[PDB]
Amino acid sequence: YTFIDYAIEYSEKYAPLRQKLLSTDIGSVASFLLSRESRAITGQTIYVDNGLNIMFLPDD
Amino acid sequence: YTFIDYAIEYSEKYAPLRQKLLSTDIGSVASFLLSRESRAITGQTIYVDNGLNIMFLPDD
Amino acid sequence: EDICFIAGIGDTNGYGWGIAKELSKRNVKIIFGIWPPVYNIFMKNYKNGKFDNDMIIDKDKKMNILDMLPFDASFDTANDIDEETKNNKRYNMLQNYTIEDVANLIHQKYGKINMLVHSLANAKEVQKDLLNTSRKGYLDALSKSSYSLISLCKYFVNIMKPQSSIISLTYHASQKVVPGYGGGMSSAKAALESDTRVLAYHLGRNYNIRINTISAGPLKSRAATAINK
Amino acid sequence: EDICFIAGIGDTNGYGWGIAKELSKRNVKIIFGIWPPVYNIFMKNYKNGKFDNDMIIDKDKKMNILDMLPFDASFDTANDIDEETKNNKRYNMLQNYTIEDVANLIHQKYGKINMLVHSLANAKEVQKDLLNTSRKGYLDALSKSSYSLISLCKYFVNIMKPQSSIISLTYHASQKVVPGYGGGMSSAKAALESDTRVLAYHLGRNYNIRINTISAGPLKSRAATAINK
Numbered sequence: 001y002t003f004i005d006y007a008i009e010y011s012e013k014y015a016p017l018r019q020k021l022l023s024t025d026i027g028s029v030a031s032f033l034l035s036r037e038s039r040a041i042t043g044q045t046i047y048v049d050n051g052l053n054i055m056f057l058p059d060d
Numbered sequence: 061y062t063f064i065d066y067a068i069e070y071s072e073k074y075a076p077l078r079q080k081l082l083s084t085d086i087g088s089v090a091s092f093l094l095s096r097e098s099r100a101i102t103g104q105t106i107y108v109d110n111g112l113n114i115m116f117l118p119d120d
Numbered sequence: 121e122d123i124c125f126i127a128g129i130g131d132t133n134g135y136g137w138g139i140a141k142e143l144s145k146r147n148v149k150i151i152f153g154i155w156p157p158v159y160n161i162f163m164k165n166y167k168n169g170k171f172d173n174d175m176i177i178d179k180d181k182k183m184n185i186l187d188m189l190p191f192d193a194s195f196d197t198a199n200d201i202d203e204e205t206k207n208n209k210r211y212n213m214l215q216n217y218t219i220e221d222v223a224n225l226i227h228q229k230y231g232k233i234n235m236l237v238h239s240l241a242n243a244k245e246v247q248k249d250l251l252n253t254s255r256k257g258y259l260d261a262l263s264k265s266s267y268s269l270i271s272l273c274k275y276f277v278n279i280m281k282p283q284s285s286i287i288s289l290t291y292h293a294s295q296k297v298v299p300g301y302g303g304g305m306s307s308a309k310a311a312l313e314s315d316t317r318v319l320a321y322h323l324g325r326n327y328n329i330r331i332n333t334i335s336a337g338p339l340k341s342r343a344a345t346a347i348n349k
Numbered sequence: 350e351d352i353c354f355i356a357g358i359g360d361t362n363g364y365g366w367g368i369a370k371e372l373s374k375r376n377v378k379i380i381f382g383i384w385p386p387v388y389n390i391f392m393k394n395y396k397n398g399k400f401d402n403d404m405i406i407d408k409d410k411k412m413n414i415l416d417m418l419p420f421d422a423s424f425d426t427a428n429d430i431d432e433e434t435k436n437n438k439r440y441n442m443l444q445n446y447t448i449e450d451v452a453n454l455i456h457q458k459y460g461k462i463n464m465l466v467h468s469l470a471n472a473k474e475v476q477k478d479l480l481n482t483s484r485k486g487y488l489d490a491l492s493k494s495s496y497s498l499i500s501l502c503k504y505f506v507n508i509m510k511p512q513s514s515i516i517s518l519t520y521h522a523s524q525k526v527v528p529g530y531g532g533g534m535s536s537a538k539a540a541l542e543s544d545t546r547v548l549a550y551h552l553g554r555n556y557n558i559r560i561n562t563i564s565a566g567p568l569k570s571r572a573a574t575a576i577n578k
């Protein structure tokens with residue numbers, strides 16, 4: 001049922017935070033990185049994925 | 061002249077961003093992570109060091 | 121007066137829109153860069169109020185779009201437009217849609233900006249696995265999805281103020297293998313993330329400008345639906 | 350009402366103070382967790398107005414400190430306190446300074462909080478390179494600098510509201526070698542970063558709580574000087 005539906009399904013079941021990822025979640029992070037508030041951050045890859053990236057083996 | 065003076069001087073000469081790192085610089089980022097504005101970020105190590113960590117070989 | 125150019129918007133279902141919505145929440149003027157092939161269809165949907173609800177900023181505010189310009193990240197300058205695209209129905213009634221032209225266009229109408237967002241990707245062969253992706257497809261993916269960021273910076277840095285900031289979107293596929301994310305997208309994202317570091321050095325030392333990239337999770341956007349796997 | 354507990358503040362020259370200052374910019378009540386050895390010196394100075402300037406938040410705002418409590422991150426509960434420190438000239442007259450005691454203390458006076466900052470580190474043998482650090486000094490570094498975070502989480506998770514956030518400070522010496530960062534501090538930061546991930550899993554799944562760690566650059570704090578190398 002399409003690649004994206006698998007990823008979203010997997011992300012909502014195995015990520016540390018089991019919540020729906022909204023485009024505005026990335027939006028608020030973008031907004032912060034674009035402001036002077038983050039003057040000391042540069043050349044970084046910030047993960048905004050409910051933490052899925054830290055998992056290795058899934059629970060179920 | 062101590063380790064910290066070497067660390068600071070080296071950071072202000074080779075970091076992608078040449079400027080003094082203030083305790084408030086980390087403070088503003090810590091503020092973002094502690095608020096709901098970062099609801100989708102967790103289990104991460106965010107670098108606030110003017111980008112120093114991305115360097116390998118110093119310029120001169 | 122913060123001005124932000126968001127390159128890579130064709131609708132309200134992607135991240136670019138989520139980014140614009142959150143920015144205007146903080147009163148920053150937004151300029152959209154729309155891919156020519158869907159520019160008129162976008163303006164049409166915009167004019168008939170199809171995005172009206174999508175523009176209501178939580179706090180009862182209305183999202184303020186300064187301008188919407190046709191923009192194609194695969195063309196650096198005017199003399200880069202080939203006759204095939206030069207005659208295409210979608211690009212005919214449009215002009216000044218190259219990275220350099222829109223940079224000048226924006227500078228001329230609104231002056232210097234201080235925020236830039238790269239939120240676009242393109243891979244003709246995303247449906248084929250890396251092994252069967254062709255050289256033409258692979259390079260097309262890098263050209264449109266990776267190099268486009270470098271060209272944006274090179275040309276836009278001239279119309280940006282010191283201490284400006286730039287971001288782009290990437291996917292973890294560049295670091296760990298995700299079957300289905302083919303055609304060189306993974307390669308392009310890997311180049312994007314590395315280029316971000318290198319560009320951070322140059323833009324940081326020469327202009328005191330910052331650049332970072334966000335590695336987002338899955339979002340059922342229009343382009344996402346495309347990836348059939 | 351946002352309430353943040355900052356563990357690790359003995360002066361205004363550290364990161365804890367910079368974090369506190371910035372938080373008060375957003376109007377969050379700050380609760381300080383001071384190490385007993387420097388508690389009296391801190392209070393004495395605070396009261397004698399030796400930090401009045403340091404408490405000025407640009408917009409005239411006066412940093413609002415809700416409470417100041419003695420806190421020792423090496424003791425989980427009251428029966429973990431050995432007699433020697435129990436009767437130490439600096440601790441003897443204080444009470445409820447263990448991790449579990451400050452959680453209950455904060456809970457009984459202010460109720461549930463929603464922000465926790467781990468801003469402390471400690472290594473007796475920091476002056477010795479990793480190769481020549483003793484098992485005792487090494488374990489002491491991991492106990493104070495790393496475990497303290499896990500223990501803070503275990504006890505504070507019951508006084509924290511859902512969707513609360515936790516952060517700690519780390520240093521790049523955990524990933525790359527910096528000679529001079531001894532005593533097992535590099536080891537402690539490696540563990541801390543790793544534990545931040547494992548905890549993000551347990552806290553996220555069970556309590557809807559987030560936890561991240563900030564890898565900061567060099568700051569000439571009081572402790573930074575202890576690194577005689």
Ligand SMILES: NC(=O)c1ccc[n+]([C@@H]2O[C@H](COP(=O)([O-])OP(=O)(O)OC[C@H]3O[C@@H](n4cnc5c(N)ncnc54)[C@H](O)[C@@H]3O)[C@@H](O)[C@H]2O)c1
Nearest residue numbers: 129130134135155192193239240241289290336338339343
């Ligand atoms: N959706 C996700 O699950 C996901 C996850 C992580 C990262 N990303 C990244 O987010 C970014 C935006 O993607 P999205 O998923 O929101 O989808 P999206 O479909 O809204 O965005 C892609 C846009 O790029 C534009 N485009 C293609 N070629 C172009 C060109 N030559 N010039 C200008 N515009 C061009 C298209 O008009 C389209 O609107 C991409 O970089 C993508 O890789 C997305």
Ligand SMILES: NC(=O)c1ccc[n+]([C@@H]2O[C@H](COP(=O)([O-])OP(=O)(O)OC[C@H]3O[C@@H](n4cnc5c(N)ncnc54)[C@H](O)[C@@H]3O)[C@@H](O)[C@H]2O)c1
Nearest residue numbers: 359363364384421422468469470471518565567568570572
């Ligand atoms: N200053 C830097 O250059 C630098 C760089 C990167 C990371 N960090 C991190 O920042 C954090 C704070 O350090 P800082 O450098 O701002 O210095 P700091 O001297 O203000 O912080 C250390 C504090 O921890 C407290 N402490 C020690 N043992 C304790 C215990 N058992 N219980 C409770 N408190 C105890 C001390 O009172 C002291 O105030 C540390 O975790 C450190 O690793 C600092």
Ligand SMILES: Oc1ccc2cc(Oc3ccc(Cl)cc3O)ccc2c1
Nearest residue numbers: 007241242243244246291338343344
């Ligand atoms: O021609 C193409 C092919 C694929 C694409 C994927 C995109 O964004 C993503 C969608 C989903 C995921 Cl999991 C990652 C992405 O980068 C964006 C544009 C694309 C254009």
Ligand SMILES: Oc1ccc2cc(Oc3ccc(Cl)cc3O)ccc2c1
Nearest residue numbers: 067470471472473475520572573575
């Ligand atoms: O007993 C000790 C010994 C060393 C310490 C170093 C600290 O913070 C840092 C200071 C400078 C740098 Cl570069 C990194 C740090 O983690 C903080 C507390 C410490 C306590």
